[model samples]
Target: MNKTDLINAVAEQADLTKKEAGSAVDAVFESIQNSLAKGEKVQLIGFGNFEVRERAARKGRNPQTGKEIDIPASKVPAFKAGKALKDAVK
Candidate 1:
């Protein structure tokens, strides 16, 4: 589901108003963003873990031109599902 759908679910589950649920959901995502921006991990015990991963610079070929190119290293955000989440989905 999308963000709006998730907000709706949260509201229904928590018996919260839509606006309140929206803000709460936004806060959760924003908090995760903030943590990742600082290269920090956010772990929700039963849900998942969010953190940053590093990509090494490497050579890449341009498919259109068949030209070799250099790819710069970068940091990216990632998520790993926890055991509970994996079990639930299974």
Candidate 2:
């Protein structure tokens, strides 16, 4: 499901109005993004861990052009599901 669907679900489950649910979901996303921007991890024990991961610079070939190019290093956000979430999904 997409963000709208998620917000709808949250609103239904939490008995919150749509506006409140949207704000809550937005707040969560903003918090996660702020934490990741600081190169820190956001760990929600029963849900998952969110963090920034570093990618090393490397060479890669362009699929269509078949030309080699250098890929610069970068930081990317990542997530790992916690045991509780994994169990729930299973």
Candidate 3:
């Protein structure tokens, strides 16, 4: 679901007002972003861990033109699901 959908669900599930739920959701997201920006990680044991991963510079191709290009290294966000989340999805 999207952010609005999640906020709505959180509001209903937690008996919180929409504004409260939205604020809470934003807070959680901000916290995660802050941690990742600092090169740290956030681990929610039963759900997953969020961290920044690195990609090495490499050659890539444009799908449309099949043009070769140099892809610079970068840091990206990643998530590794915890057992509980995996089981829940299963």
* TM agreement with the true structure for every prediction: 0.86, 0.89, 0.89
lDDT of 1 by residue, 11-46 (tens): 999999999999999999999999999999999998
Segments in model 3 whose C-alpha atoms lie over 4 Å from true places: none
Positional deviation of residue 19's Cα in model 3 after best superposition, in angstroms: 0.5
Q: After aligning candidate 1 to the native by TM-score, how far in Å is the CA of 35 from where it should be?
A: 0.8
What tens-digit string does per-residue lDDT give for candidate 2 at 37-73?
Answer: 9998999987999989998999999999999999999
Q: Compute the lDDT of residue 6 as modeled in candidate 1.
A: 100
Off by over 4 Å in 2: none
Candidate number with the higher lDDT (2 or 3):
3
lDDT of 3 by residue, 14-73 (tens): 999999999999999999999999999999877899999998999989999999999999
Task: Give model 3's TM-score versus the native structure.
Answer: 0.89
Instruction: Write the candidate numbers in order of decreasing TM-score.
Output: 3, 2, 1
In order, the Cα lDDT scores of the candidates are 0.96, 0.95, 0.95
